[PDB]
Amino acid sequence: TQSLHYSSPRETLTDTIMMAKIRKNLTFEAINQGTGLSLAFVTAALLGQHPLPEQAARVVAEKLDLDEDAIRLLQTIPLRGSIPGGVPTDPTIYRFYEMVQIYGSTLKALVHEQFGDGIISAINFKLDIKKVPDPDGGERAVITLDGKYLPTKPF
Amino acid sequence: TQSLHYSSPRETLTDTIMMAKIRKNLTFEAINQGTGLSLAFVTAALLGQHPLPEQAARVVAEKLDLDEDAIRLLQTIPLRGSIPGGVPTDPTIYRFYEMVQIYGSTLKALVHEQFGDGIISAINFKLDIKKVPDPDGGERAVITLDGKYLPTKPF
Amino acid sequence: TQSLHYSSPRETLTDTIMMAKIRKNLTFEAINQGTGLSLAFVTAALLGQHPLPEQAARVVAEKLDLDEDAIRLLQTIPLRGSIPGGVPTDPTIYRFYEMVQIYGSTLKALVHEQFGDGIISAINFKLDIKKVPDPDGGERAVITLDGKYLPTKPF
Amino acid sequence: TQSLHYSSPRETLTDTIMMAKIRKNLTFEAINQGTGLSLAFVTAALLGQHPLPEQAARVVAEKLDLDEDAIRLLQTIPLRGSIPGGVPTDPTIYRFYEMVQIYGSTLKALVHEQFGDGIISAINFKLDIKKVPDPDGGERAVITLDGKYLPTKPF
Amino acid sequence: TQSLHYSSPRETLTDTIMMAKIRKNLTFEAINQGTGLSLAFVTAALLGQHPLPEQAARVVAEKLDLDEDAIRLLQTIPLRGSIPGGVPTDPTIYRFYEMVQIYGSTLKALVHEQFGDGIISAINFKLDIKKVPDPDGGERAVITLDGKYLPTKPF
Amino acid sequence: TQSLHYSSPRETLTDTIMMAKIRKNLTFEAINQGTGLSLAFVTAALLGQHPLPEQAARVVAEKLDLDEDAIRLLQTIPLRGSIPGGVPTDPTIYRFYEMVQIYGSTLKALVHEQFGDGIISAINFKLDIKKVPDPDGGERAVITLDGKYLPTKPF
Amino acid sequence: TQSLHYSSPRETLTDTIMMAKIRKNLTFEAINQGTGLSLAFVTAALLGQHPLPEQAARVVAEKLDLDEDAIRLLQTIPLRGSIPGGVPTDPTIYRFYEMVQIYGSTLKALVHEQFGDGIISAINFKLDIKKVPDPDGGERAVITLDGKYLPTKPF
Amino acid sequence: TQSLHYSSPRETLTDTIMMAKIRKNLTFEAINQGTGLSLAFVTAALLGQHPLPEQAARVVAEKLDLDEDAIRLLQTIPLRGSIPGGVPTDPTIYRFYEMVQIYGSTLKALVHEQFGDGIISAINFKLDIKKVPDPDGGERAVITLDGKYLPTKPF
Amino acid sequence: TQSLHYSSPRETLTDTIMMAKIRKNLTFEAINQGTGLSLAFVTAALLGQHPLPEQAARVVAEKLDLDEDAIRLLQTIPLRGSIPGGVPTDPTIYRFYEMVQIYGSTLKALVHEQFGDGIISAINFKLDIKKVPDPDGGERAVITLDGKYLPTKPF
Amino acid sequence: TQSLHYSSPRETLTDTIMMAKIRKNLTFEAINQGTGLSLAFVTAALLGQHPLPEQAARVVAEKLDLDEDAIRLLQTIPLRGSIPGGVPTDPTIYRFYEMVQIYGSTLKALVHEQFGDGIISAINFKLDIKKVPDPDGGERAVITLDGKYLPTKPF
């Protein structure tokens, strides 16, 4: 599996993808139909953060009119990172950034209390987002971060 | 309810709290017994990120030998933020920071697709962490971020 | 409703809008006539910070000679943020930045005193600017920031 | 009128003031009674961002048990700035920071359109915060920024 | 008068201006003949930091062979700031930056002693530079900064 | 003449000086009477930016009740720089910082046009502040930066 | 097992350890005798980057005269990170920093080629340093970084 | 041997190289066959961090369809550095960055203990990566950093 | 003599120069033959850091196939600075950067001890590089920094 | 020889050294008599950038009245770096920083032309400063940087 150490070719591909999606007024849910993969994984891949397996790349390529060069690039492992410079200003992204700023020390404390020394993985890891009704009217998003506990063992 | 615009008095209190917890070899779960509040909220408060109601402040104060000045400070709204300088280096905290760096644009995209313009709140918001078994051996942490959808409406 | 996680396409559209506005010597007030929306909101959208509803987008597009791709892009939710790098050097923008630097702790202190724990929203939010005469000669700007109070409650 | 070019002595006085306010469970509104000055100005002065005139300094000192060294220091012009490092992490302050990040270019645009070249002053300037009911239940903060227009004229 | 909230179109114009000036081997003094404006103001405008009024723009446009689009853009209020990133490395610019680094606290102290609380304006402001002989051989530059004092008064 | 490569000793001495100046209600002009040196030079020295000759160090020491250790430290060449971090937030200091941000490229252009390649010195340099009335009411500061021209010649 | 979200207490302990090591002229190899653990791990723990098991903590505490509070702190999981601000200036540390700056893209490229998508762990990880003779005279250091491959798999 | 002090021409060549490698679905191991040099060195050179000797440049050029301009550029000494801005966000590179962040002080300590004052070279230096089975299933990467010891000797 | 306040025109010219130098396989010493100027001065000019006198500009232009526009640009005083962002990552440049980081306070201390208050000039300044054999085998660079002492005198 | 990975204890020692040197009015030249070492090396060590061998430490300790704890700490290898934050503001240090900013690319270019690929060492390295008369009046400093060339060779 090929990989890139710089982001500019994948950012160009992502821009080609987004302009086709907006021109055709598609949803990510619709683009993902037939990949057999979870919506969050494929969306992240279309946005430049994961490789797609070849079959999923060709399924999404048919819906967005991508050429063979684009299909090849969609299968490459990218230089990951979706917030240029690390600190977002967009309010939607910032709220998730803010959760980590405020609750980061609590997450560390409770991980070590309940699991032990080590980390919760961001690689052996699954993300998903669910819309649920709010009991007081309106809607809520339940974002689930599901990661393997990897212990730190004295050697 | 009183508030502070600078963090040094609360950091001093947090250090008093942690040295009592380590000296007495207590868990956060044990300190929280009798508050009637969720473990994640009270842990964040002990770590300097929330005010406690007076009853919860006095319950935890009895377990950690805190004086009346400390009880008063525990009830104040703090200057929040738990990662000095915004960018963590500790690997445990960093993994949560990393999730937002990689999946931030995906979260934005799927929020706007499934909810619309606006944000998922970090204020009308609940966090919790659950330990569950991994089907392949080991354990996993399921962290749930549960926030109200607040729309952006043209005016 | 479509959205973008990166700013380059909306920055290009904004430049197209600004060069047409300058070539035609139009005002924002004149562009805004007949949009059904407030001048501050539509101006922010033209400058790349909000989506416009379809009919308002078509009204401004006719005055500025924009095509159907530009009309679609005007309706997309953007990656928000109008000050590259966060810190402005332009004196006009800097004064508003400076108001927050100097009065930020005062705002926090009085929000908590008069409302309680939590925030004043920048999303459930309206801005407007009004010109008033100064009694000592000259003119003043009255800028109104009108945000919903969102409480932080123990959970 | 004396002044300081560094913040540490004034930060010590602000800490002494906040610890007294919290000990006595006072409000800024109650501390301000009898100064004849606006709540936002006097609050900012107590938080280290303005000098107070002598009579106002003596009124607030009597409620906070300040001594003569502290009364003299409260009358000094400080090195202003209330957000260490410029970028806030506290959510309450951040929302006002975010307002400028999002609408900064819009404010510039409308200032130049409605007033002309130049700035809206942050010095010939008045700030106030008002609480009002939201018609849908809850409350809103109406923050007014009232600044003189100073034009940039070719010489 | 029109304005821009981003610098790229004006940077392009400034480049066109400088390339014609170097190609024609002109001085700013000669370009400024007949504008009715001072050399420092017009030089700053040509370098992208001020608008020119229409007739002065046409006077400089004739000497530099600029088109009507360029003339219109010369009349726009720019996004101001002449040092990318804020910190200069060029020795000539750095010396003026260094004067403020070293004497900044002295300037604050003496402004407050001789004028009072408030600022010396950078907008109600005139700059000029004169060359005078040095009595011990050589030449000196006398740069004069002439700014209005704007008091900070209790409100 | 002794020198220091770190600022903390002169920062402590500057604090000693300012606490005495405020306690005694002195002006810098009064402290400087009898040094035979310029107010701006001696003020900068008291604020940690220059050494004083012994005679001048003893004159200011008598006014401020400084001891022989402080007199020796006043004669030491300091590590210069009066704005921690380089970027000021205090409005009074920032205005002078802004003057360089806005007019830095103009200063460069006109130095090279009127003097040649090289720099205007900040070392062979004199600073002075004058207060003059403004015709429209109020007052203006005329700040004079007078520096040697030092050419850059090929080698 | 206890943990800390801030580094100040472990930095204090590390200083106590280092002053005893220097006063007693001990080596890390001698302190490590009888801990049952590897020299690199125990050295990192003494320098504030790992917890020690209780018995190993007592072994090193006896050699360095540490008390029971220090022994408890040695067993706490710390806030990890050994380079304040991320970027070292010390030449010895900088060379290892430089290896990553220069070869980072090569490491990523060869990890993906030889293992696949994912990471080489810094937690399931062992470090050791060995001294070997250089054939051309002198000595070399062979530093071994031994990390588990953690794949990124489509989900 | 020619060299460049800026990276953009070499970044263009690296892009041409990566697009060819991806188009032809080649491995670095396959590209390196016939150079007689180590895989890590040649990979780094292809990624823009080393010059290649002429014969090695011609061997890799033939597999990637490089022309004579590109062969000459591959032989030039580049401006080295593979992480724009110094701080990586890509998780694969970050783990190696994190190794230095955590163990940097330990490496310094053990270098000085086992070798003496001075540095472990990053120039007289060899890097290699080896894949080995993990006894518990899966695989590990053994990365060897092999650097000359250069002492700091008092002169 | 003309001057520029932005670097992009000389960066383009420097690229033109280096592509010709590499294509032609020239040395800087060969390019400089016949200018009557020092290799370090002319090399810095070619790399965008000085203007050349006309005679020298035409000598280098003939060797490099530069046209009359490039000759005019070579005579222009540039915006100086050769390390984007100030901090180099290239090992060759970094070593000189490191020399100042390590010995900066020593240079200050010894300048003030041996010369007095003031600076060693980087403007009235000459740089040169010599290669000499090392007694132990290999080679050494002797770099000479020769600058005017400029005293700081009270005013 | 012992070493430290943090700078605070050595900064404290350096302060003790400088206060005794200023109190006794000594020169570094006089302190260095009888050490057997060069003035630049010993000055750097006193300023916290090098260890001294034991007998030289005792020689300087006698002249500055340092204790046995101080003598031991003078012998430790420090965490090196003499400019907090990397960027100096002091004019005397800044001039040497500026020499590297301006001539850094020229130094790289000429090192590669005259030596080859690799670096000029900052560790196998000697620095000295000499005062020489200027033929046009005044004095100059000749600073010599003498570093070993370390080649970068293919492996």
Numbering used by the authors:
A (entry chain A), B (entry chain A), C (entry chain B), D (entry chain C), E (entry chain E), F (entry chain D), ...: 2 to 156
Sentences from the paper on this structure:
Here, we present a new pipeline, SIMBAD (Sequence-Independent Molecular replacement Based on Available Databases), which can be used for both contaminant and brute-force approaches. In this section, we present three cases in which SIMBAD has been used to determine a difficult-to-solve case owing to the unwitting crystallization of a contaminant. All cases involve the crystallization of a known contaminant. Although the targets were ultimately of low importance for the structural insights that they provided, their solution prevented further misdirected effort on the part of the researchers involved.
Crystals of the contaminant protein (cyanase) grew in conditions expected to crystallize a cytokine complex: the vapour-diffusion method with a well solution consisting of 0.1 M magnesium acetate, 10% PEG 10K, 0.1 M MES pH 6.5 and hanging drops composed of a 1:1 mixture of the well solution and the protein complex. Crystals appeared after six months at ambient temperature. The crystals were cryoprotected with 20% ethylene glycol. The crystals belonged to space group C121, with lattice parameters a = 136.56, b = 94.13, c = 89.11 Å, α = 90, β = 125.49, γ = 90° and five molecules in the asymmetric unit. After refinement it became clear that this was the protein that had crystallized instead of the cytokine complex. Manual model inspection and modifications were performed with Coot. In the crystal, ten molecules of the protein form a dimeric pentagonal ring. Normally, this is a logical step that saves computing time; however, this case demonstrates the value of making no assumptions where contaminant origin is concerned. SIMBAD has subsequently been modified as a result of this case to use a Matthews coefficient to check whether a search model can fit into the asymmetric unit prior to MR. If the full PDB entry is too large to be used as a search model, only the first chain is used. This alteration allowed a solution to be found at the lattice-parameter search instead of the MoRDa DB search in subsequent testing.
